[PDB]
From TrEMBL, chain A:
Residues of the full protein shown: 2 to 73 of 581
Name of the protein in question: Phosphoserine phosphatase SerB
Organism: Algoriphagus machipongonensis
UniProtKB/TrEMBL annotation, chains B, G:
Domain LysM residues, every copy: 172-219
CDD domains found in the cross-reference section: LysM
Descriptive protein name: LysM domain-containing protein
Top-level division of the source organism's lineage: Bacteria
Natural source organism: Algoriphagus machipongonensis
From TrEMBL, chains D, I:
Source organism of this protein record: Algoriphagus machipongonensis
Protein name listed in UniProt: Phosphoserine phosphatase SerB
Membrane-crossing residue ranges in chain numbering: none
UniProtKB/TrEMBL annotation, chains E, H, J:
Top-rank taxon: Bacteria
Organism: Algoriphagus machipongonensis
Listed InterPro entries: DUF5908 (IPR045459)
Protein name: Uncharacterized protein
């Protein structure tokens, strides 16, 4: 490839993603601020998600209370 | 006493409940300011994720208030009602600074201030001051000066919780009117319709699907931890 | 000054070797489930006490300035 | 290990009674964390007009013999 | 941080506390990088 | 009713669906503002590599909206249709602040606002306010004041996904 | 001597108690400034938690003061009382700089300054100066210049604690007037009503619930360790 | 860095990414100082 | 040791195919470094409108038994 | 620092040395936190 660019299937104008838990998509009310994924030789792969949450006027955290992001 | 021109006053206080006056700590102006100004600020949290068309807005805080005004001191002799003094404006400015600026060794701080003029009543602290001297007698005695001032706002913490009467945590009572249902009333009190069987058990109701229109009900709070 | 909770076991011999008193004390104390609290010249050695009354209540929507927590 | 289940830090206006070995009641941070917490550490900071305290709760599961250096010659 | 072991004493400069908040963020991100390297 | 001069109104609300009114929470002005102003912002990601002549700018997000206007309070007695009051503008400003500024202990926050005048309909919250007092009676009762205001925009999250009818899926 | 036009003076000093004059270190102006200006600043701590409607703002400290004024030097020959000099304003500016700006090798610093004109008396140091030269003789001798100046404020540390007469740490005495009670007087002196049995024991009172209206009491301080 | 082990996740604040570039430089210079101390 | 001869990091616009254990061709960085490089690590970062990837090449000469802690009791 | 082991080489950017003084303060406070953790 001597084209001078990086070959992608579509324009790079819009980045999209999906998060699936136990087979299905997390509801579109949750706002995901950032996603990180790492892999390396002789180490175990990992990932991180940053989700906006918490409201001082309610005194709670609705995403944390859900059953979507529970260990296991 | 409608016809009386009222003059602005500032009094100094020792305690945060504003009941113990500083002795000789009252200033009265000789000329009123032209105008005064207030400032109000409310802060919100505006984080949002990429790809979206609007952010989820959450109230954060109410910031403290601010008052500003200007003063004029003059002892030249053209204003009706006052006399020319031997030392000009020297004792007027020295008494004004003793009230609003000077450090008090009894309380290890400057004074609490109450500002009253007509409808206005404001409690707080001095933040900023500038004084500019304009006219002088030939021997160097000043006879005219201009002052700009900025005041912050003070609320004691016991009074903040009484003004924010913060109330699923407390108890409530209502009277049944015709047209009421039990799951609609539970939604307006708790935010969820699902607690209707706990409200009916706490009131001894068996036929809760028809309420009689004189009954007074209780609504207990939700349990914690 | 000291205040130390008792234990049931008794050794017939025990050896301290080429270590400080503080370090030796820490090793022996953990082995028995004890925590060391040092305060104003007194050393107090006790089991965790999760039964006492709370001193105060700290609330997110009213008194907290900063907060960090983790579950793993 | 059970005392290491939930760990964290709470910062608030200072008082002279919070010391390691006491219990506080934590509210308004979600069902996952709300309840009575055991205090394992305290930091008092006094400067520029105010006194604040950082209260630490929960234990670190690591043992002295595992995490500290230079025990032996 | 979830530990009081990693806080530093606060000293300001009368140069006339914005710079206090920037230095405190840099100590927080360094010590998270050092902790993640000991993971398997 | 074409010939009627309509006046601007502000109502306070308790819930995020704007269906439960605060009791005695409606303000009606006596003089309309001269004009009002909107603001719109769209943010893009503009990283590019060195050696290149252009970047294909990418969509990031749409920022919240903003409304601004000014008010005048006057009870001097030269405006046709109104009366001079014993206390001037004291009760007009105190009722205006109770609607748009004051903390509500039932909801632990200030109020939700709906602003309607003619074709205009806007929902949100107050961010900023300045009030300057201009004329006084001899005993210190104010009779004229000027206010500047800034309002942010509120959308509930269930309504955002219904307006962004997002549709290979 | 009311009719005398007083002129502004600046004197240089060697010590922080302002008693040892620098030799040939006194400047007297020939034209007075038009006006002068002061500046005052007080700083507070304003941290608050989220969810709240106000903060109880706390005292932090009082910042140093500032004085500013402008000068004019002119030896053209139209001002009554003065003579035209062969070298113009060269020696006037060189003497002014030696007093307020130049480094002194005896004390390893610039000089302490006292500024007096009429009612004004100010001690401190120079921070800033700008001098602009306006008119010249044909051979390049200047005859007019304008100077702007900024002065900071100096307090010696032994005098700061004497002006802040900082006083539950010291001893106190009062005389009993009719209408006084022992728990109300204890609250105004200590901030708490609960110390009334320690005040009564230190004065030998048995019937403290009725005080006689000529008694002088002592109020000891609280112990520290 | 020549290693992906030392990168941190990027979180910005909607306070209205200049401060993102300053914190990333401070993590880079700390970890170079720690590596040079283990040299002989 | 030979695989530790040249080491480094390359950052570019993200694609889903670069994984540890693949080869990339590196050009334009001088004769000392140009050529085919073996990838030993990948970091994917997605935020604020874009997807980028950090590709790592070359091995660290250190062995597991030398650099890792707490292997033994 | 009381040791020359912890100084970094100074590289500036011609972007037109304020940012040099901020990064140097962050390296100083990190290495003091790491030293205090090894105290008993």
């Amino acid at each position: 490839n001597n084209s001078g660019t990086i070959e992608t299937s579509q324009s790079v104008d819009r980045v999209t993603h999906k998060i699936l838990i136990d087979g299905s998509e997390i509801p579109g009310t949750y706002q995901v601020k950032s996603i990180q994924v790492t892999k390396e030789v002789n180490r175990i792969p990992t990932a991180r998600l940053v989700i906006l949450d918490g409201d001082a006027a309610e005194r709670d955290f609705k995403v944390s209370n859900s059953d979507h992001f529970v260990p296991g | 006493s409608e016809g009386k021109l009222e003059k602005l006053r500032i009094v100094a206080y020792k305690d945060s409940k504003f009941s113990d006056e500083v002795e000789n700590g009252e200033f009265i102006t000789l000329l009123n300011p032209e105008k005064y100004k207030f400032q109000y600020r409310v802060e919100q949290n505006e984080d949002q994720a990429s790809g979206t068309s609007s952010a989820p807005i959450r109230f954060n805080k109410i910031l403290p208030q601010t008052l500003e005004f200007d003063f004029l001191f003059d002892r030249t002799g053209v204003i009706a009602g006052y006399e020319v003094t031997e030392d000009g404006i020297i004792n007027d400015i020295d008494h004004f600074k003793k009230v609003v600026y000077d450090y008090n060794g009894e309380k290890h701080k400057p004074n609490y201030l109450m500002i009253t003029w007509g409808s206005l009543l404001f409690k707080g602290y001095l933040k900023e001051m500038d004084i500019e001297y304009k006219l002088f007698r030939p021997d160097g005695t000043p006879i005219r000066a201009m002052a700009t001032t900025k005041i912050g706002e003070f609320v004691e913490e016991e009074l903040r919780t009484a003004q924010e009467n913060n109330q699923p945590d407390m108890s409530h009572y209502r009277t049944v009117k015709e047209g009421d249902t039990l799951p609609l009333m539970t939604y307006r009190i708790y935010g969820d319709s699902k607690y209707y069987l706990e409200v009916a058990k706490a009131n001894g109701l068996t036929n809760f699907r028809r309420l009689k229109t004189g009954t007074e009900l209780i609504f207990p709070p939700l349990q914690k931890q | 000054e000291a205040d130390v909770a008792s234990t049931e076991n008794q050794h017939t011999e025990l050896v301290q070797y080429d270590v400080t008193d503080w370090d030796f004390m820490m090793l022996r104390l953990q082995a028995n489930g004890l925590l060391c609290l040092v305060d104003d010249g007194k050393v107090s050695i006790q089991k965790p006490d999760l039964s006492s009354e709370a001193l105060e209540t700290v609330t997110f929507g009213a008194t907290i300035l900063e907060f960090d927590a983790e579950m793993d | 290990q059970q005392l290491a289940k939930t760990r964290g830090r709470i910062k608030f206006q200072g008082i002279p009674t919070v010391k390691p070995g006491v219990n506080l009641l934590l509210e308004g941070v979600g069902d996952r964390f709300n309840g009575k917490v055991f205090i394992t550490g305290v930091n008092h900071q006094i400067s520029e007009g105010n006194w604040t305290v950082d209260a630490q709760f929960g234990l670190n599961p690591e043992w002295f013999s595992e995490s500290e250096s230079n025990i032996h010659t | 941080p979830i530990e009081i072991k990693e806080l530093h004493i606060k000293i300001t400069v009368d140069d006339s506390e914005d710079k206090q908040q920037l230095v405190a963020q840099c100590v927080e991100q360094v010590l998270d990088v050092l902790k993640s390297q000991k993971e398997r």
